[PDB]
Structure formats: structure tokens, C-alpha cells
Amino acid sequence: QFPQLDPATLAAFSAAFRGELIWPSDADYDEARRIWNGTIDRRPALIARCTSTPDVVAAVSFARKSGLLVAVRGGGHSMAGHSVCDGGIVIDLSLMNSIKVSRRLRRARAQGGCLLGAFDTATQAHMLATPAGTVSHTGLGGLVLGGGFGWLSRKYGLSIDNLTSVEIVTADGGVLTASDTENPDLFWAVRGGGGNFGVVTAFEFDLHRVGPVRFASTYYSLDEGPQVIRAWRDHMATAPDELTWALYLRLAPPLPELPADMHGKPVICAMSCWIGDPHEGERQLESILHAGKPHGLTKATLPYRALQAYSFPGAVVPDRIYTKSGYLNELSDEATDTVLEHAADIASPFTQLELLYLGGAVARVPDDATAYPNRQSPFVTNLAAAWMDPTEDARHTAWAREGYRALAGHLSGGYVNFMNPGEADRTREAYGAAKFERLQGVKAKYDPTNLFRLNQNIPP
């Protein structure tokens, strides 16, 4: 964290850098190096809080010339801890939060450090939206470059399926535009290939009109686990794009809507919504709400921005997390039973075994159209352990590991944006031989020195 820096190279950097630099001796250094995954404790030599594209140019070129290991940071939610490093530079984008929306053209230009909630707020000023993740403080930058799915995804695709161009700062310090008509090889790679190919300082999106959303959440006893998941699995195979339905197995929150008898016990929290007319959605949601007997049932007509802000109503921000995720082509009765066995052993009130159904518009993009793999797998299982006590790491990590291992045989692929710090190994398997090979050629061209290796890495 104290390498010798050449005063010449450093001087040129600050002359060209209009941002704020955070050094290990500064008082805000310890807070600035913390990311969402609180198990990641790392001490960069320097934190560069970039405020503009020229700032990112200055920082990238200062890292290349100085040979510093490069962490790039959007919203900080890397479950692998990629957005902070030991001994290098954090290229921090969090201050680059500015959005422009044209309601007439249904387009949004968003800087590379935006949080989802800032994006959704800006577009919803005009009743517009585009798919993103379900938790507002997730960074738009990392989420999009991995694909990005959420409430709107079954209707309007992944985030990358609404992305029309990017401004990206490559390792040599140049600034490029990547679109379907300009460096289209790089535009294929950034739509699914992570931060491997440069620092995206601006995303441009197509927008869709999204009015009020009929929404429901409820909790089921696990005694009805088998019926519920089986009805969930069977129904989403032929469900319309407009219905999104998700299962979150977890300890029941000690909330008033819920009988105190269920507090602190493993339950299925089913959340659903209808991206369409709210009268149709009311009928549609009631059709899928009694696969089991629903407790703490809350139904609401929400502005889309409120739906985006809903997940999840927790009492405490979890400090420590560990993830194991994977896709499934099918969810058999045998996998359902294993999912239910391991859900019953959930110990922390912050931990969720998530069961998602993508499909819809996601699965109708041709496989090779983006670098995002597994479009044809509809199911996503995510063993998402979360806790507070650093002395309980082993217990919560062991729950996700053994849950993943008993589901291994059914798992068919992995989402790069759910990889944990010990899963660099999984990269080529995750993308598949054909996609990986094309990504390596784009890397060889755009980042031959692998300047950007703090990601699900693709070596050139």
C-alpha cells in the first residue's frame, strides 16, 4: 500500500485530474475502501474518486504507467470483492452519477457510476424505465456489464438488451464509442463480458413506458414447500411475459403482517408483479397466490420506481455475505426437495435461498448476440448467505457451499455477477467455449496487458 511512485508520473496525473484522491493516511480512507461485501478487507495504495471521463482517462493512464493493480468501482456490490484491491488503485466512479433522459426519444444516458435508484428516479419522472436489478443501491455499471436482470426483464430483456452504445476508456487511455455501428466487436464484449475491456463512463439506453405495477408479496409455511415450488415451476414455463414471480426462502421477518408464530422460522417469501394493466394483474396475481396458504399477504399498486425500491424491507444492513449461484434448464422434483432441505437449515435472518425465473424476452435474443451466456436456462438458484458476526463466517459459508454442492448436478451454468471471491476458476465454464474464445480475441485487441483483471477475468 506504499509503493514508490515516480513524482513525474504522479504530478502529471494530478495536473490532469479534477477529482479527489484518497491516500492511506487520510481519515476517510478506511470508509472509502469498504465495499458491500464486508468480508473483503483490502488496502489500496490510492483511491481516485473520478468526476468525469477525463478524470477516468487520467487515472487509467496513471495506473498503466505506474504499473498499479487496477480496481474499478461502480456501486461496490461485487460479491467477489473486485472493486477494491491490495496495493493498487481504486478507480472509483461513484461520484459519476449524472443521467440525461429524453422523454420524446425514450432514451437515457447514464454515467458509469450511477446507482440503480438514481437511474430509476430520473427515468420514472417521465413514466419510463429500462430493466435493472431489484436493489436500488446496486451499481448500474457492474450490473449492466454482466447482463443485468430484474422485474422488467421477462418483458423487456436484460439491461444489455436495452443498451445502444457506451463511452468506454480502454487500457491505453483512449476514449471510444461502442455501438452496433461503431467498434461493434467491443460492443458485443461489454454486453456481458464485465469490466474486462475498459471503464465505461457512460451507458445509453432505450426506454419503455411503465405505468403502475400491481404487486404482491406473501409468505408460505415450508410445510407446503413442495406444492408451492412445484406450482411455481409449472406455471412459469407457460406464463406470459407480463407476469414475474419469484421465491425467496428465508427466515420469516418479525413483521406485523406475519403471525408471531412464524417469526424467525424458514418460510417461502413469494413476490410477484404484473408489468401491464393493473386490473389484469390483479386477476393474474390472484391466480398464482394460493398455490399454498398465504400469510402476511400484502398487495399494492406501485409506481415502477416504488417496486424497484421495495426489495427488501430488512431491519439491519448485513455486513458479511457469501454467494453461490447457478442456472437450471429444469427444476425437477428432486432438486425441489434438496432446495427445501437446505432452506430449512437457514440460520441467519439475512440469508435467502433465491429461486428466480427469467425466460420471456431474455430467452428470445439469439445466444451469440451478446456475451451473456445461459439465455436458454430459465431458472436461477442463488444461495445468498448474509450475516453480521465475523466470528460466524464458517457457519454461513458452509451453508451456501453444501447447498450448492447438493444442487451441483442440476446446475447448468453461472451468472458472472454472482461469482464469489473463490470462483475465478469458473470463468470459462460460465461463458462457454465459443463465447470465451471470442472474448479473448476482443481482450487481445483492447486490453492485451490485462490491465483490467479485477473482474470475472478473461485473459487475452
Ligand X SMILES: Cc1cc2nc3c(=O)[nH]c(=O)nc-3n(C[C@H](O)[C@H](O)[C@H](O)COP(=O)(O)OP(=O)(O)OC[C@H]3O[C@@H](n4cnc5c(N)ncnc54)[C@H](O)[C@@H]3O)c2cc1C
DSSP symbol at 80: T
Q: How far is CA 182 from the centre of its chain?
A: 27
Sign of CA dihedral 41, 54, 159, 116: positive
Tell me the C-alpha distance between 209 and 280, whole Å: 17
| Neighbouring-strand partners of residue 96 | none
Question: Which one of residues 19, 88, 117, 142 is an interface residue with ligand X (CB under 6 A)?
Answer: 142
Tell me the C-alpha distance between 315 and 349, whole Å: 10
- Minimum Å gap between C-beta 47 and ligand X is 13
83 in contact with ligand X (CB under 6 A)? yes
Question: Which one of residues 19, 88, 157, 195 is an interface residue with ligand X (CB under 6 A)?
Answer: 195
Identity of residue 179? S
246 in contact with ligand X (CB under 6 A)? no
Show the binding pattern over residues 1-40: x = contacts ligand X (CB under 6 A), - = does not: ----------------------------------xx----
How many C-beta atoms surround the C-beta of residue 448 within 10 A? 12
73 in contact with ligand X (CB under 6 A)? yes
Tell me the C-alpha distance between 107 and 457, whole Å: 31
* Per-position DSSP letters for 9-42, written without gaps between them: HHHHHHHH--SEEE-TTSTTHHHHT--SSTT---
Question: Which one of residues 58, 143, 252, 268 is an interface residue with ligand X (CB under 6 A)?
Answer: 143
Question: Which one of residues 117, 193, 194, 318 is an interface residue with ligand X (CB under 6 A)?
Answer: 194
Show the binding pattern over residues 145-174: x = contacts ligand X (CB under 6 A), - = does not: xx-xxx------------------------
Answer whether the bond into residue 452 is a cis peptide, omega within 30°: no
C-alpha cell at 433: 467455449
Q: Please measure the distance between the N-terminal and C-terminal CA atoms of the chain and give it in whole angstroms.
A: 27
DSSP symbol at 398: H
Contact 250, 351 (CB under 8 A): yes
Segment contacting ligand X by CB under 6 A, of 78-86, 179-187, 334-342, 424-432: 78-86
Segment contacting ligand X by CB under 6 A, of 70-78, 102-110, 118-126, 340-348: 70-78
* Positions in 370-429 near ligand X (CB under 6 A): 417
Show the binding pattern over residues 270-309: x = contacts ligand X (CB under 6 A), - = does not: ----------------------------------------
Residue 124 vs 338, nearer CB to ligand X: 124
Tell me, by CB under 6 A, how many residues bind ligand X. Answer: 34
Show the binding pattern over residues 120-139: x = contacts ligand X (CB under 6 A), - = does not: -------------xxx--xx
* Interface contacts to ligand X, rule CB under 6 A: 35-36, 72-79, 82-83, 93, 112, 133-135, 138-139, 141-143, 145-146, 148-150, 194-195, 199-200, 417, 454-455
